[PDB]
Amino acid sequence: FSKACLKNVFSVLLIFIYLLLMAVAVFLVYRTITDFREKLKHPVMSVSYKEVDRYDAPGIALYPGQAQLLSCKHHYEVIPPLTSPGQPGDMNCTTQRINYTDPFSNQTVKSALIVQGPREVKKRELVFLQFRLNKSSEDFSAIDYLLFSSFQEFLQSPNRVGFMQACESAYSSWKFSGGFRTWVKMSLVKTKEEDGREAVEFRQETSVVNYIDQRPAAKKSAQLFFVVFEWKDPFIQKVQDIVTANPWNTIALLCGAFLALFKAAEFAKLSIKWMIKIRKRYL
Amino acid sequence: FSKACLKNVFSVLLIFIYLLLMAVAVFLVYRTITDFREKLKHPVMSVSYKEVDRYDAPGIALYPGQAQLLSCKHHYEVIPPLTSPGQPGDMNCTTQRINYTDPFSNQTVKSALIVQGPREVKKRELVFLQFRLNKSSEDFSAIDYLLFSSFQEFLQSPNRVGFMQACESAYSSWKFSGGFRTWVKMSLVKTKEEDGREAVEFRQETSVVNYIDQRPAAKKSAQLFFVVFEWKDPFIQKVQDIVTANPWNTIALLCGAFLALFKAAEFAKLSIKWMIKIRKRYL
Amino acid sequence: FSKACLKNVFSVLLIFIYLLLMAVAVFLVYRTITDFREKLKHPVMSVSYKEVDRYDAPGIALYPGQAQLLSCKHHYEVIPPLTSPGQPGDMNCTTQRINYTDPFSNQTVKSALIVQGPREVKKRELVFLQFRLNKSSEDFSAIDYLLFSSFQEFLQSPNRVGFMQACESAYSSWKFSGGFRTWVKMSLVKTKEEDGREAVEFRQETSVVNYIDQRPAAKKSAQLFFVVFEWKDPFIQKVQDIVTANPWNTIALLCGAFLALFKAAEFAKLSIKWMIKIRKRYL
Ligand SMILES: *[C@@H]1O[C@H](CO)[C@@H](O)[C@H](O)[C@H]1NC(C)=O
Ligand SMILES: *[C@@H]1O[C@H](CO)[C@@H](O)[C@H](O)[C@H]1NC(C)=O
Ligand SMILES: *[C@@H]1O[C@H](CO)[C@@H](O)[C@H](O)[C@H]1NC(C)=O
Ligand SMILES: *[C@@H]1O[C@H](CO)[C@@H](O)[C@H](O)[C@H]1NC(C)=O
Ligand SMILES: *[C@@H]1O[C@H](CO)[C@@H](O)[C@H](O)[C@H]1NC(C)=O
Ligand SMILES: *[C@@H]1O[C@H](CO)[C@@H](O)[C@H](O)[C@H]1NC(C)=O
Ligand SMILES: *[C@@H]1O[C@H](CO)[C@@H](O)[C@H](O)[C@H]1NC(C)=O
Ligand SMILES: *[C@@H]1O[C@H](CO)[C@@H](O)[C@H](O)[C@H]1NC(C)=O
Ligand SMILES: *[C@@H]1O[C@H](CO)[C@@H](O)[C@H](O)[C@H]1NC(C)=O
Ligand SMILES: *[C@@H]1O[C@H](CO)[C@@H](O)[C@H](O)[C@H]1NC(C)=O
Ligand SMILES: *[C@@H]1O[C@H](CO)[C@@H](O)[C@H](O)[C@H]1NC(C)=O
Ligand SMILES: *[C@@H]1O[C@H](CO)[C@@H](O)[C@H](O)[C@H]1NC(C)=O
């Protein structure tokens, strides 16, 4: 039967058309919900992890001040013994020197030394830094450092000063002591704001290790700073609005609501007929 | 047609009534599920973050023991250089002194100094504390401290002693060393128990910094304790039962199940008619 | 009416049969989705917490090297003052000594001392370790340690060497300094891979505390290492694929999709009749 086959194929096509129409309606309702959500402030946010084979190269903005960088080197899961503490050399890191006004206190300019961070988390790649300071007039010996998402973004940024101020606004600033080697295991946390930008903040697990110096007492006045940066785990924590992070839950809820509405329509159509029949039988 | 319009509006009203009835049934089923869940112990819990513009003022319960508080001051994202280490003055913090019996070991009473914590996370507000100890007979120089949810709750609590014991039961106790300035970046984690109470625990990221003292050798016997408390990020981690944390997923699942049951009812109504017709045709 | 009751009970049985068939179809579709997901690499993973009354005993693999273990003891929420620093005795921990080749650098063999960790988190059980080293030729004084999921698994493992290499592959290695007592608050994080194995990694919150020594200057050459291990909180972080972690969301979405397809089928059946009637009326 050619007519029967034509009717069947047209019915299948109409099934496709109505399924597409329902999908479009659900998508429009979900987009309306998202647009209404993004307006309100402080929404409930969910957590999602995503393992990465290789990390993007981060930026480690040091603040030596009067301290001089002594040595920078990349290593894998082990630190070879130092040839001679307090001596320069063996320095090759992608270091960019920029200094700018502090966004918090506009009166002070801070000198930032940005060093490209490790990126092969699987190989336990780490970066070892050494600093020296002959004379210091301060109660506490420390160097400030903050971590931002990517070194490449800073390198190719059009407004370098503003990018560093935005990084200062981010909550990823710490310190490492003098006379100690601190192993910093940094973790990446990405949060997506409602406006669209993805703010990035870091989490660290320091391991302070005392440094024993056999150098002559003449050079004991100078203090040596050591720090090691390494990725703790390949997993990247992602924070996003609970509705937007997993839209499939909202889609399922909306489909359930629409199907419930249609079932209620069918129930009303049956019930009006039933009550009309009852009224006709009674009177 | 007045009758047609009346029938249509009555049908819409009946749609509303049946939709409300379905919502009530789904709500009752969800409440039954929640009541059954809350009985079982150790449920699977989810994680939700919620950014806050301003933090509630926390309580930092120090345990100086023989140590004397030297100076307390609130600062913003920077610590001014100390005028004179080891000297009192410039002390203004909301400090409440209470001491009580240890819930773990009832034989020992512990002296707790509670200091109101920072609350403007956006401005990077921080609290700086100094302690002094002339003579000490101990292998390790440290001061215990634990953090609870709100200082105001402790201040207006009816049973002060019991509140501190409950805080001791909470897992938010740490230490900071002597001769070092430790920057404590505390994070708030709220977990909601099945009974209804919301237990609060803290997460910290210390940054130990060595302290260099130029004071005369006569006063070197006394040891100085420094600590800084600051909120790491405005986000507050919230932990709740997976079913209760996002009830919309359970509501969607229940609506889907009810609609599937109704579809099965329709399928049975069609299939019984089909098989009756088949049986009548055959015999 | 016996016939009416028989028809009703048969209709109920057919309802059960069709509900079971729908459940089987949804289960097959969900299993297909899971099998397709598990093939792709780097999926989005969710976070679930689960409180435990008691922890499984972990394994703390120390790396003293030339250092000699001085004392091991289990305590509850308090460390009694040391009877005499630098002296052995009071040693009773379940310690297993194994040494093997480093998976990263095959040329070096590492000596591992595994100590059973605390398990009563509710009682704040902790393990205190002491180490001694007379002569050392190294710039930094530290002992490596890594934490794996269970001590019992290592104890009864058939291939001990391979298990330790797998633990080394896990990202749970840290250090503790010399001359300081570091309080390690370890947290358990379980991640389930797509292949099926559950990798385990740890998170720690160290609390470095300076150690004051009154021992005679003759013995000051030797350095003493102190470390304390304790569970931070009973909650265990579990990381799993977002689809697999909460299958109920996927089941609800699939049921909604199938019900939407059936509703589209009904709409097509009505619309074809409506358009056929319209065409017949027109021509
Ligand atoms: C290492 O340093 C040398 C200069 O001493 C430089 O030419 C080389 O590119 C550096 N390699 C890396 C990977 O930094
Ligand atoms: C950085 O500081 C120096 C002075 O130390 C001065 O040249 C100017 O403020 C900045 N210059 C550079 C190199 O950006
Ligand atoms: C500091 O300088 C900046 C420059 O933009 C300005 O916006 C800010 O108001 C100033 N704050 C003061 C006056 O302390
Ligand atoms: C510090 O002292 C060393 C000693 O050799 C000297 O070479 C160097 O120029 C001095 N300046 C700094 C701060 O590096
Ligand atoms: C600061 O200290 C003075 C007393 O020296 C006190 O009157 C004032 O209220 C304090 N301010 C704050 C904010 O603590
Ligand atoms: C706190 O301790 C003191 C003794 O140091 C004693 O008065 C009593 O135990 C407590 N008193 C206060 C001030 O609560
Ligand atoms: C310690 O004293 C408390 C007071 O309530 C009591 O409950 C507990 O059993 C005591 N523990 C002992 C006797 O060690
Ligand atoms: C500690 O020593 C200082 C030295 O001036 C003295 O003023 C003070 O009374 C002593 N007592 C304490 C523990 O503060
Ligand atoms: C404590 O040490 C003794 C030997 O000195 C041993 O017999 C006993 O089993 C140990 N107890 C524990 C719990 O380790
Ligand atoms: C561990 O090391 C020792 C040498 O210190 C040697 O016997 C062998 O390499 C290993 N032996 C044991 C006890 O496993
Ligand atoms: C180190 O030895 C192991 C033994 O299995 C081997 O697999 C690996 O390739 C070696 N790496 C080298 C040659 O550096
Ligand atoms: C270290 O010195 C102590 C001093 O009594 C001695 O007993 C011991 O045998 C020496 N060896 C080690 C490394 O323990």
Author numbering:
A (entry chain A), B (entry chain C), C (entry chain B): 57 to 339
From the reporting publication:
Proton-activated chloride (PAC) channel is a ubiquitously expressed pH-sensing ion channel, encoded by PACC1 (TMEM206). PAC regulates endosomal acidification and macropinosome shrinkage by releasing chloride from the organelle lumens. PAC is a homotrimer that forms a chloride-selective pore in the membrane, and it senses changes in pH via its large extracellular domain (ECD). PAC channel is closed at neutral pH and becomes activated when the pH drops below 5.5.
To reveal the mechanism underlying PIP2 inhibition, we solved the cryo-EM structure of PAC in nanodiscs with 0.5 mM diC8-PIP2 at pH 4.0 to an overall resolution of 2.70 Å. The structure adopts a conformation similar to the previously reported desensitized state at low pH. However, a strong branched lipid density is observed on the cryo-EM map of the PAC channel in the outer membrane leaflet, between TM1 and TM2 of adjacent subunits. When trying to fit a diC8-PIP2 molecule into this density, we found that the phosphatidyl group is reasonably well defined, with its phosphate group forming a salt bridge interaction with R93 and its two acyl tails interacting with a number of hydrophobic residues on both transmembrane helices, including W304. In contrast, the hydrophilic head group, such as inositol-4,5-bisphosphate (Ins(4,5)P2) moiety of PIP2, is not resolved and therefore not modeled. Nevertheless, the local biochemical environment of the site is consistent with PIP2 binding, in which the hypothetical location of Ins(4,5)P2 is surrounded by several positively charged residues, including K97, K106, and K294. Moreover, small, but notable, conformational changes are observed in the transmembrane helices (TM1 and TM2) upon adding PIP2, which supports the binding of PIP2 to PAC. The pore radius profile is similar to the desensitized state of PAC without PIP2, with the smallest radius of 0.43 Å. Therefore, the PIP2-bound conformation also represents a non-conductive state. When overexpressed in PAC knockout (KO) HEK293 cells, mutation of any residues R93, K97, K106, K294, and W304 to alanine significantly relieved the inhibition by PIP2 on pH 5.0-induced PAC currents, confirming that this was indeed its binding site on the channel.
